[PDB]
Amino acid sequence: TTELRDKKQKVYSLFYRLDVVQINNKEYRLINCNTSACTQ
Amino acid sequence: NLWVTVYYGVPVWKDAETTLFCASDAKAYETEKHNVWATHACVPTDPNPQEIHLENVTEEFNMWKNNMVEQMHTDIISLWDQSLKPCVKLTPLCVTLQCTNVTNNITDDMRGELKNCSFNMTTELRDKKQKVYSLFYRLDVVQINNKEYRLINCNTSACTQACPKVSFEPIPIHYCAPAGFAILKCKDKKFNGTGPCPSVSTVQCTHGIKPVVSTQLLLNGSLAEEEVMIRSENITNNAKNILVQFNTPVQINCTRPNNNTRKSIRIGPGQAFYATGDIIGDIRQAHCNVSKATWNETLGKVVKQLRKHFGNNTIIRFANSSGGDLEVTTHSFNCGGEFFYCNTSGLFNSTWISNNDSITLPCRIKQIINMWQRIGQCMYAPPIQGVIRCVSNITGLILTRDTNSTTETFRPGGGDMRDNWRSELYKYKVVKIEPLGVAPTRCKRRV
Amino acid sequence: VFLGFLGAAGSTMGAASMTLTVQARNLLSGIVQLKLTVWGIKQLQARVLAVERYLRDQQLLGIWGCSGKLICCTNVPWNSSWSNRNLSEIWDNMTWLQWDKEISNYTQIIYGLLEESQNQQEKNEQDLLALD
Amino acid sequence: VFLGFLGAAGSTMGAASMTLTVQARNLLSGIVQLKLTVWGIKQLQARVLAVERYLRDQQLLGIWGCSGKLICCTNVPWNSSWSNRNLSEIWDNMTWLQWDKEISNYTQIIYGLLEESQNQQEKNEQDLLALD
Amino acid sequence: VFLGFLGAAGSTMGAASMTLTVQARNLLSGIVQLKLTVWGIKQLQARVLAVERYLRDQQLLGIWGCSGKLICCTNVPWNSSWSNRNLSEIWDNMTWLQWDKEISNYTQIIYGLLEESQNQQEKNEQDLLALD
User: Which family does it belong to (chain A) (predicted)?
Assistant: First the structure.
């Protein structure tokens, strides 16, 4: 989601496999989300 | 032979900055209405403010390095923010608007200026939405890419709704120094902006100063004695500006002839938003009324001064600003919570040689505003229900100085609101008393 | 005659000495009388700084064996290099502000001997007088 | 005999004067020993107000040339209009609370002369005795 | 000779007494000079605690009729049970730290008589000398 609260926007980004984990291309998850929130 | 003798309570002082604090009568606290302005948390004034003229005491006054202004400025800003934090944020208003022209009395004198938009807005019932509508000035919204429009603030920052209970009425504030510091006040009717004052007095605290925010024109300030006062950091430097203080109040009467309603919409959960209902009544553009002969007369008195710092054979012309940002281009001011932007071309359009009637000033209304040139945040004014009209005293000008051997042109400016505070605080300065002193005296001390 | 706070500021040092207490009282003053808030820690800070401001110098007068202040003598002789003027040229023809204008140059220098000499020597001496 | 804080409060002014120090100590007391929080600025404010409360009057005793307080004499005569009673009618037959009940009417009035008369005159005089 | 803050700490109590003021000054020190913030209430708290820390004991010296401190005598005799040593065994052969190591055991006990005896008796007596 972008600033325009209505339609999303398909984007891409790189993430280390130390940061993400497979759920269950394939589906992955930010590791922190199972423990707590994360701040930039 | 003389000896070192120690003295205490010596009437001497050094120019020094400290932390000033406010004072505010006792009737100003009776206005209640859930803390109007940033004031309530402020020590009541004494019923008998004291003073004392000081004979034989003279010294320098420098309004251009008077740090009282700087404190006051940032303190007012702080107050502003604190009064908004506990109020409703308008973040979910940032949506695509579907807008159309408003058919004002045919054909078209009003030029619309407002669009009756509509969109599906969220309500308390977190499950089903409802379509609502509201009016917004075309100064607040902008076309995306009926047509689609956007709240202008959403490209820069979030916006917060000012509480409907809190007001913006300027209230007289007194400033006091802590023990060991003195408030000095010259009573000299003459003052160049800096230098020695033959007649110096001192006071407990300052006189009540209203925190009036305005550009170009100064409103509800203090009056000058003798002649019109011209003050500038450097008259010859046109990179600077000129402060003009009047001798006689110049009445200005501004009106918004719109008995409009407030279709408040419950954009919860819980918190409420005040949208613009309908506009009915005398559909005329808001404007200001100025006594023309009065303006001409006073302007002349101003030119006399100018003559006195430029020569007895020069030409003085007055014109409007260089243009650009509306906030600087036009005269901005608050009346009753509403923000006006007026075309002062109707005033600043004249000339003087070598040696009713009334004026109507077209104004515009904005609801999204930015204080003190500050970016990163914005404040939404709620529409004020009913016809809004008020009157005030013009008490000075903020002028700037524009093939340089005769004709010079001057124009209105502003922007930096520290100028406004300084236009009053020039009468004051703060010094630090040093009680301890020594001196030679014929005395040899025994056991 | 009561003049008022700093009422003698515009007079000779001799004249001004008459009413040092009228000033002394208000050097510390006293009285005065949603959380935080502007002013919330400013009145705090200021009122604190007043107390410190006062005692910082009061302690010096405590060290400089007087205490009964406003005025007291010492056993330190005045060095002629510290603005060589006559008493009538000083006390009967100069304000305190004008005085500081000059003498301020030797402030810490004079404090040296005030902070010490007498304070050191007045004592010991007394202990020795207590021998019998 | 140690009575305790305000232990002589219920006695004649003469009797009470015996143990003024027992009270004096606790007039300032001392000791005592997520941010802000309730109490966070209340213990602050209170402990401050204690210090001010104390010194505000202590300075007056500093001005009223005594310092060695609890009790000291002056050179100001008592005006008979200020409750004309005999010493046995006062000191041997009246508590301090009962005393204030009456004399409180002339508080500032008496302070006038205490704040001044002697403080003014005791001095100058001394400077003149220092002539030789 | 100026040694510096605590410059005589490593010397005999007799020697150390020479320069008590050099220490005294910095016992209270003074000077020092987005809201809250870390340090925001820590410099506050600390600077406060310094003032209290000081006065708490200073008042005791106020009560113990001296005021002109660093050193003063009393009319309380030393009980031999409080570390029975000779003067040369004490003053000429012991540091202040070593002294406290022993005498600290009777601190409050000694304070009892200091807080009282003389303070009680010195007075009354004087009032009686004022009879004529």
Answer: Belongs to the HIV-1 env protein family.
Do the Cβ atoms of D3 and D16 come closer than 8 Å? Answer: no
Nearest Cα to Cα of residue B206 among B415, B393, B49:
B49
Three-state secondary structure call for residue B160? strand
Calpha distance B320→B346 (Å, rounded) = 9
Q: Cβ(D16)–Cβ(D43) under 8 Å?
A: no
Q: Amino acid identity of E106?
A: Y
Question: Rounded to an integer, what distance in angstroms lies between the CA atom of residue B186 and that of residue B59?
Answer: 9
- Angstroms from E117 CA to nearest CA on chain D: 12
**CA-closest candidate to residue E11, choices E98, E87, E71, E105:** E98
**Residues of chain B contacting residue C46, judged by C-beta atoms under 8 Å apart:** 18-19, 21, 178
Lookup result for tokens 């710092």: B309
C-alpha C78/C-alpha D113 separation (Å) is: 37
Residues of B in Cβ contact (< 8 Å) with D56: none
User: What angle do the packed helices E107-115 and E117-129 form, to 10 degrees?
Assistant: 10
Of E25, E30, E68, the CB nearest to C52: E30
Q: Is residue C63 a contact partner of residue E21, using CB atoms and an 8 Å limit?
A: yes
Residue whose structure tokens are 């500032």? D108
Whether the CB-CB separation of B445 and B15 falls below 8 Å is answered with no
Other CB atoms within 10 Å distance of the CB of residue B382: 19
The contacts of residue B208 (CB under 8 Å, 6+ apart) are B25, B172, B173, B174
Which residues between 101 and 130 in chain D have a beta carbon less than 8 angstroms from any beta carbon of chain B? Answer: 127, 130
* Contact in structure between B444 and C73 (CB atoms under 8 Å): yes
CB interface of B with D, residues 384-443, below 8 Å: 443
Q: What is the dihedral of CA B350, B353, B355, B361, to 10 degrees?
A: -10
* Interface contacts (A, B; CB < 8 Å): 8
**To probe the interface with B, which of C73, C74, C100, C126 has the most B CB atoms within 10 Å?**
C73
* DSSP string across C1-70: ----TTTTTTS-HHHHGGGHHHHHHHHH-------S-TTTTHHHHHHHHHHHHHHHHHHHHHHTT--S-S
Q: What's the N-to-C CA distance of chain E in angstroms?
A: 49
* Touch A-B: 3+ C-beta pairs under 8 A: yes
The Cα–Cα gap between C42 and B348 comes to 43
State the burial class of residue E107 (Cβ atoms within 10 Å of its Cβ: 0-12, 13-18, 19+): exposed
- Resolution for the entry shown, Å: 6.8
Pull the structure tokens for residue D25. 């100590």
- Please state whether the peptide bond connecting residue D132 to the residue before it is cis, i.e. omega within 30 degrees of 0: no
Pairing of strands B407-412, B315-318: parallel
Q: At what angle do helices E42-63 and E20-28 cross, to 10 degrees?
A: 130
Q: Measure the CA dihedral B303/B307/B312/B313, to 10°.
A: -70
**Nearest-CA neighbor of B13 among C56, C53, C96, C107?**
C96
Helix boundaries (H) for chain A:
none
> Which residues of C fall within a CB distance of 8 Å from B79?
38
Distance of CA B329 to the CA centre of its chain: 16
B83: which 2 tokens?
Answer: 């009064």
* E-interface mutation test, from C36, C53, C55, most E Cβ less than 10 A away: C55
Cα–Cα distance between C3 and B435 in angstroms, integer? 16
Compute the distance between CA of residue B158 and CA of residue B139 in angstroms, rounded to an integer: 17
How buried is C1 (Cβ within 10 angstroms: 0-12 exposed, 13-18 middle, 19+ buried)? exposed
Task: Specify whether the CB–CB gap between B167 and B80 falls below 8 A.
Answer: no
Tokens of C36: 């935080």
Strand partners, C18: none
Query: What is each CA distance from B232 to A31, B64, B316, B396, D34, in whole angstroms?
Result: 63, 9, 17, 13, 50
Chain pair C-D, CB pairs under 8 angstroms:
19
